[PDB]
């Protein structure tokens, strides 16, 4: 459950 922490750095995972 780490798919919209992309809100900063949207290619980090």
Swiss-Prot record:
It comes from the Eukaryota. Transmembrane segments: none annotated. This is Dynorphin A(1-13). It comes from Homo sapiens (Human).
